[PDB]
Design a protein around this nucleic acid. Structure first.
Lengths: 215, 211
DNA sequence: CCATGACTGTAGGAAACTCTAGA
DNA sequence: CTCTAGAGTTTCCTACAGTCATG
C-alpha cells in the first residue's frame, strides 16, 4: 500500500501527522481508520464528540491524537485535508504495536541427567510479550535445532484472554552422545518479530552429565 | 531545568521521569504558567477546565493539544517509581510564532544626495516573541547615529492573539558621489534563533542631484 | 555488607524526510 | 507554474550514566 509503516510500544501515546493541513483551526480534514476497535471504518473530525474523545481526538493543529495505545489500536490510518485552495493532500499509515515480556524463566530443570538417552532438561517461560515472539535454546551459547540428534522441544503459546497478551512455554529434552561434555550449559532466548528490540536470555543452568552404569 | 520550545497551535507532551508507564501511579504535576493563578497541581485523573488545556496521560506524561503564549511557564513532575523511589523532572518553557514576511512601505523611488530621505518603513506582523528588525545596504547592514543615519521603530501586540507587530522606518543622508543605484533591504531577526532571518525584497531608488 | 556486574533508563548526537524559499 | 535548492523539523540510532541485581 501507499501506506507507510509505524510501530509503537503498548501503553504509550501516539500522534499522527495530517499532511499539508492548516496549522490552526478552523480546519477541514477527516481521518479514516479500520482497526480492532473500529467495526469497519470510523471517520473522525476536528470537533470529535463521540466516545472516541477519550481515545482518538483530532488536535487543534490537525494531527490525530491517542492518549495511550492498546492492541485493539492496530490497523490502518488515513487522513484527507484541503490546503486552501483547493490543494488536497493524503496520508497512509500502517500501525503495529508491541509489548516486552519479563526476562524468561526456567522451571522443571534437571538436577542431573544421563547420557545415551532422552532427558527432560526443563522449560522456559515468558509472560507479557507482544507480538507473540519465540523461545530458542542454546547449548554452551550455540543454537539447538529440533529433529536432529535427540534434541526435542515441547512448545505452546497461551494468550491471556483479558490482557490479550502471551504466556510462553518451551520444554527441552536431549539425548546426549555417550562420552560428551560432563558439565554442558543450556540457556533460553526470547526474540520478537522485528528489530523492535533485542533478545532476552535466561539465567543458564549447568547440570551435571552422569554416564550410564556398565552392563 | 531543561529548556524547551515549540510552535503555537502545536501539541506538547512532557515525559514524567522515573514513573510507572501503566496506571495506577503515584505522581504529581505542579506547574506555573500564564494560565495559572499560582502553582497548579494536576492529578492522575486531573479535572476542571484544565482537561481542555493540559492533561495527564495513562502513561504519566503531561500533554497540551495546542500550546499558546498563555502556556509559557514552569513544569515540575515529582514522581514515585514504586515506593519510596523518587525522581523529579524539570522543564523551562519558551514558545514562538513565525510572523508574516517583512514589508517595506512608503519606500522611495527617487532620493536626493547630501540630505535625509524617507527610504521606507519595514513592517512585520504576527510574531512571538517580538524579535528585532534591521536594515542593510547592498549586502551589508546599517547602524544609527553614524554619519547621519537614524531610525524610528516601534512594537505593538495584537490584543486578541498576543503576537507582535514591529515597524522600522529607515532614513539616511546619501554621500555625494556614491552609488546612484543602491539596493536596500530589511530583515526580521527572530528572538529565538529557531529559524534564519527573513528579508524584504530590495528597493533600488535613484539618487538624484540638488544644486 | 561490600564490591562487581548487568540492566533500565535517559542524554546527546546524527541522518532522513518534509517544508519553505527561489528561479 | 513547474522545477531546483537550501533549511527546518522530526525521527531513529548510538552512547553515557544511574540504578538494580548479583557474587
Amino acid at each position: 500500500v501507499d501506506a507507510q509503516n509505524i510501530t509503537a510500544r503498548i501503553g504509550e501515546p501516539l500522534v499522527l501527522k495530517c499532511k499539508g493541513a492548516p496549522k490552526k483551526p478552523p480546519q477541514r480534514l477527516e481521518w479514516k481508520l479500520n482497526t480492532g476497535r473500529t467495526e469497519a471504518w470510523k471517520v473522525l473530525s476536528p470537533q470529535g464528540g463521540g466516545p472516541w474523545d477519550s481515545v482518538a481526538r483530532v488536535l487543534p493543529n490537525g494531527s490525530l491524537f491517542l492518549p495511550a495505545v492498546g492492541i485493539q489500536d492496530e490497523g490502518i490510518f488515513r487522513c484527507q485535508a484541503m490546503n486552501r485552495n483547493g490543494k488536497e493532500t493524503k496520508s497512509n499509515y500502517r500501525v503495529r504495536v508491541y509489548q516486552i515480556p519479563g526476562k524468561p524463566e526456567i522451571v522443571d530443570s534437571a538436577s542431573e541427567l544421563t547420557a545415551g538417552v532422552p532427558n527432560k532438561v526443563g522449560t522456559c517461560v515468558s509472560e507479557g510479550s507482544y507480538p507473540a515472539g519465540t523461545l530458542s535454546w542454546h547449548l554452551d551459547g550455540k543454537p539447538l535445532v529440533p529433529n536432529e540428534k535427540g534434541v526435542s522441544v515441547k512448545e505452546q503459546t497461551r494468550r491471556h484472554p483479558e490482557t490479550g497478551l502471551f504466556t510462553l512455554q518451551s520444554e527441552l529434552m536431549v539425548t546426549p552422545a555417550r562420552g560428551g561434555d560432563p558439565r554442558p550449559t543450556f540457556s533460553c532466548s526470547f526474540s520478537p518479530g522485528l528489530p523492535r528490540h533485542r533478545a532476552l536470555r535466561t539465567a543458564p543452568i549447568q547440570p551435571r552429565v552422569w554416564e550410564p552404569v556398565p552392563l
